[PDB]
């Protein structure tokens, strides 16, 4: 069982490194697709539902405005995300199908996940039962075991970044802030509620920050709100570093003990960062009923299946004003994005 995980991760690393060293490029073009709907909008891009003309398949298409990417200093993060997405392979990571660029934009075409974000379902239902939360948590544990074995720190875990697919399983999608680093790194980044204290305190930090963020996610899924909140981020940071946290009275004793070890300010003591590594988490009493292989194989019956009315249904996404997708007559920012 243990040697099986070792052998799996070794093969996974060999495959990842081959694709990392020789990324794919320019595997489709814009007029292969019809636009259906804007699913999301950000400061330098949008995510669209599109239909592939030849096949009729639906996909999500992330469209990034190269000039806005440069303006907002996102060149390296954008190239990094695409390089990671074309190299990884894991059941809970969204699949990149095509990428290409034109005079104005960068395009990443991914499997469409019609269930939408965990965030929306969590806010709607209020909170998840502990079995429901544990089902999702197990998928994140396995995903971080995979990513960390590739020396990738994820750094932006939150319900907003987790999609729910038609079988009720999670898909991670966005990797701009991920970093392939084996030792320490120093960048201040992430989302305030999910920041580990060592990031806030300007320390050199490591993959343990992802296990802290798992603790925040488990707490938020099971309570309906995160462990540390306040009006403004500066105020959230003081609570995080304090190393004080309260639990709803309905939290089980096992859940509280797990969260005390994940939400551990002393990264010399935090679960996931000790000699037994991820196994301190997998073998914890809260996960006693978890069949780790069956989760990986997606054989476990999901506790929740999103409403699904067709291959291009968008009902689980917010509505946005549809804006033009302009492609300039002039090539923009060619040198910056030559590797894309």
């Amino acid at each position: 069982e243990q040697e099986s995980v070792k052998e799996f991760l070794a093969k996974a690393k060999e495959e990842f490194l081959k694709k990392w060293e020789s990324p794919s490029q320019n595997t489709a073009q814009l007029d292969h697709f019809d636009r259906i709907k804007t699913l999301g909008t950000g400061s330098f891009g949008r995510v669209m539902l599109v239909k592939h003309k030849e096949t009729g398949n639906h996909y999500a298409m992330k469209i990034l405005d190269k000039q806005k990417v440069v303006k907002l200093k996102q060149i390296e993060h954008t190239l990094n995300e695409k390089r990671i997405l074309q190299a990884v392979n894991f059941p809970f990571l969204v699949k990149l199908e095509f990428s290409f660029k034109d005079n104005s934009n960068l395009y990443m075409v991914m499997e469409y996940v019609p269930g939408g974000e965990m965030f929306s379902h969590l806010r709607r239902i209020g909170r998840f039962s502990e079995p429901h939360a544990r089902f999702y948590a197990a998928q994140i544990v396995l995903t971080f075991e995979y990513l960390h074995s590739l020396d990738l720190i994820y750094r932006d875990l939150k319900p907003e970044n987790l999609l729910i697919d038609q079988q009720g399983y999670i898909q991670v999608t966005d990797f701009g802030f991920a970093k392939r680093v084996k030792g320490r790194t120093w960048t201040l980044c992430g989302t305030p509620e999910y920041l580990a204290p060592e990031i806030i305190l300007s320390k050199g930090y490591n993959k343990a920050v992802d296990w802290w963020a798992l603790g925040v996610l488990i707490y938020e899924m099971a309570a309906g709100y995160p462990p540390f909140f306040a009006d403004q981020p500066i105020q959230i940071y003081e609570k995080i570093v304090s190393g004080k946290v309260r639990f709803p009275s309905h939290f089980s004793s096992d859940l509280k003990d797990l969260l005390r070890n994940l939400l551990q300010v002393d990264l010399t003591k935090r679960f996931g960062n000790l000699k037994n590594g991820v196994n301190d988490i997998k073998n914890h009493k809260w996960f006693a009923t978890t069949d780790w292989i069956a989760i990986y194989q997606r054989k476990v019956e999901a506790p929740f299946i999103p409403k699904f009315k067709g291959p291009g249904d968008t009902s689980n996404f917010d509505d946005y004003e549809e804006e033009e997708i302009r492609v300039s007559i002039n090539e923009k920012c060619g040198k910056e994005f030559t590797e894309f």
């Binding site: 806010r123 939150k158 992430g190 309906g224 909140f229 306040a230 009006d231 981020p233």
Partner: peptide
């Protein structure tokens, strides 16, 4: 309640990265 405090925080919608 803690829930009421959460609603009062104003950070109940989608959260941006730093």
């Amino acid at each position: 309640t803690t829930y009421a405090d959460f609603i009062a925080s104003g950070r109940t919608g989608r959260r941006n990265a730093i």
